[PDB]
Design a protein around this ligand. Structure first.
Ligand code: MG
Length: 577
């Protein structure tokens, strides 16, 4: 009986001689009622850990499997969920271990590479599906993608990453790895060296298992303290929304979006002919033509093929829900917000055969949010009367009546609104209009615009002055998502509550959507700026349309109480429409 080969029957390699197998009796309660006790075999460390985190564990093999283990799940309310995988990309990797930590019990470790009987996993699958049991997870998007891809259904998550990230209020970019969070909230130092280990082999190291186990045990204590701190800072609503938003996000990343390679290769050759022809003719008109076609070609039409899945013609971007200052979503590899906002281009993004796109956008949601949080009477009443805010401003500036307002007046009004709402003076207003709107506006005119604007929009005036006076650094949204600035900045101060509230609305809408989109097996594809794209079988065209609008209007209703939003919708076969 060699040391190393001591536990091959359990797929363990005793490297350090730091492990013992033991068989002891535990205090359970039968499936019927009577408090039954059961004998279990578990592994414990020889050298006692300096910490109080559970370091013993059960291991589940196709070999030794005691159904009584599942009785530990009976009548739990929360558990610590963790998994160890072969790599990072789900489509190309496999789940190695599924660890579940239950209070006052050694960690249950499902050895996936040595399990072929479905019966075993029945216990696990039950837990994961139980809407009434909270699964504590560190970085839940990752683990949830893997499980959902391996057809494990999961619901009710509490993400310690989300909790820690929110509690930080966006004043640090790093320090949200598990060991960091533990050293902060529990003042315990975990061994992170076993992250770099190999989990692809069919035999597991002696120390890798202890690492895995502990990395789940701590989720219980961590959950308690983080729950407490979240409640203290009044972040329950935000934290809850984000946790519930994990699953929708996974839906977007797993579904992906399909590309029509015909318009792609064709358009590539076309812009190639334009770049060559313009290079011949050329070698201000010339510069802008060449640079534009050069970027659209090389900085888009040439990069996109790299992200296509060679087999599915699908792009599976990665969404981030808390790597932004405002709180909005952000995508990468590829960054969907950097795709040209042009019909000719976006028309290459299509639904699947028997499916179709439904696309919904918010209209002037930012200006409405401003009206709400400001409680600006004129804006709120005009909105309730279904009068456009640009028209409203035009009326105030020109002193004309709506029947006498013309397109040029509305254009000037757009400049005045988008400029002055977020805190420009008349000089910056002149430059802003003259630049983005092409208006040869004089300084005297712009000064009139300023005075008139804040003469009538007295709520807005109060908002600006109060901010400018207090010069605070702490700011919140309507979900009470908080942030702390490094230094005071007027424009950013005014901008955060608006953009952050938009992020809250969109995210909650995705949650409601993901819930109400199951009866028709609908898929959520994309969320960009203030628009959402879902994909449904052409059968449920009208039904899905109603569902989408319902989710977005309901979400806006949750946060805004004296303004009503407007959701424009289109049923399209292309992103460009
Ligand atoms: Mg983990």
């Amino acid at each position: 009986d060699e040391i190393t080969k001591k536990y091959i029957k359990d797929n363990i390699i005793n490297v350090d001689d730091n492990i013992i197998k033991k068989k002891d009796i535990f205090k359970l309660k039968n499936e019927n009622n009577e408090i039954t006790e059961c004998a279990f075999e578990y592994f414990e460390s020889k050298k006692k850990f300096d910490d109080d985190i559970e370091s013993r564990f059960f291991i589940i093999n196709d070999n030794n499997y005691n159904e009584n283990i599942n009785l530990i799940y009976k009548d739990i309310k929360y558990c610590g969920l963790n998994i160890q995988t072969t790599g990072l990309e789900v489509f190309d990797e496999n789940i190695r271990l599924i660890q579940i930590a239950v209070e006052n019990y050694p960690v249950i470790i499902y050895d996936m590479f040595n399990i072929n009987k479905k019966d075993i996993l029945d216990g696990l699958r039950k837990v994961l599906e139980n809407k009434n049991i909270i699964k504590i997870i560190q970085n839940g998007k990752f683990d949830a993608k893997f499980l959902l891809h391996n057809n494990f259904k999961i619901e009710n998550i509490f993400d310690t990453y989300i909790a820690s990230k929110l509690l930080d209020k966006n004043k640090n970019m790093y320090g949200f790895k598990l060991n960091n969070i533990v050293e902060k909230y529990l003042n315990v130092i975990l061994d992170k060296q076993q992250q770099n280990s190999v989990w692809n082999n069919s035999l597991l190291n002696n120390n890798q298992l202890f690492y895995a186990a502990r990395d789940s045990s701590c989720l219980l204590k961590l959950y308690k303290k983080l729950k407490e701190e979240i409640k203290k800072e009044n972040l329950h609503i935000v934290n809850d929304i984000e946790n519930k938003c994990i699953l929708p996000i996974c839906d977007m990343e797993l579904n992906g979006i399909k590309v029509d390679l015909e318009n792609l290769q064709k358009s590539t050759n076309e812009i190639l002919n334009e770049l060559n022809i313009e290079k011949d003719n050329l070698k201000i008109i010339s510069l802008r033509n060449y640079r534009r076609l050069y970027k659209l070609y090389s900085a888009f039409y040439l990069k996109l093929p790299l992200h296509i899945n060679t087999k599915t013609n699908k792009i599976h971007t990665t969404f981030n829900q808390l790597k932004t200052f405002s709180g909005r979503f952000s995508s990468e590899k590829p960054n969907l917000q950097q795709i040209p906002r042009q019909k000719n281009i976006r028309e290459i993004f299509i639904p699947n055969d028997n499916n179709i796109f439904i696309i919904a956008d918010f209209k002037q949601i930012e200006l409405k949010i401003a009206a709400e949080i400001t409680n600006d009477e004129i804006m709120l009443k005009a909105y309730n009367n279904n009068i456009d805010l640009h028209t409203l401003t035009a009326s105030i500036i020109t002193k004309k009546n709506i029947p006498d307002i013309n397109k040029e007046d509305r254009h000037i009004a757009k400049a005045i609104n988008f400029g002055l709402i977020y805190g420009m003076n008349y000089v910056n207003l002149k430059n802003y209009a003259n630049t983005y709107y092409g208006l040869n506006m004089s300084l005297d005119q712009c000064l009139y615009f300023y005075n008139s604007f804040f003469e009538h929009y007295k709520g807005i005036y109060k908002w600006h002055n109060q901010v400018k006076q207090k010069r605070a650094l702490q700011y919140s949204t309507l979900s009470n998502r908080k942030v702390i600035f490094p230094y005071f900045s007027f424009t950013k101060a005014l901008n955060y509550p608006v953009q952050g509230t938009c992020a809250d609305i969109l995210k909650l809408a995705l949650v409601d959507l993901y819930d109400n989109l199951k009866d028709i097996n609908g898929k959520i594809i994309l969320c960009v700026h203030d628009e959402i794209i879902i994909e449904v079988n052409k059968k449920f065209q009208e039904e899905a349309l109603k569902i989408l609008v319902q989710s977005m209007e309901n979400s806006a209703s949750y946060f805004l109480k004296k303004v009503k939003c407007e959701v424009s919708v289109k049923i399209a076969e292309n992103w460009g429409s």
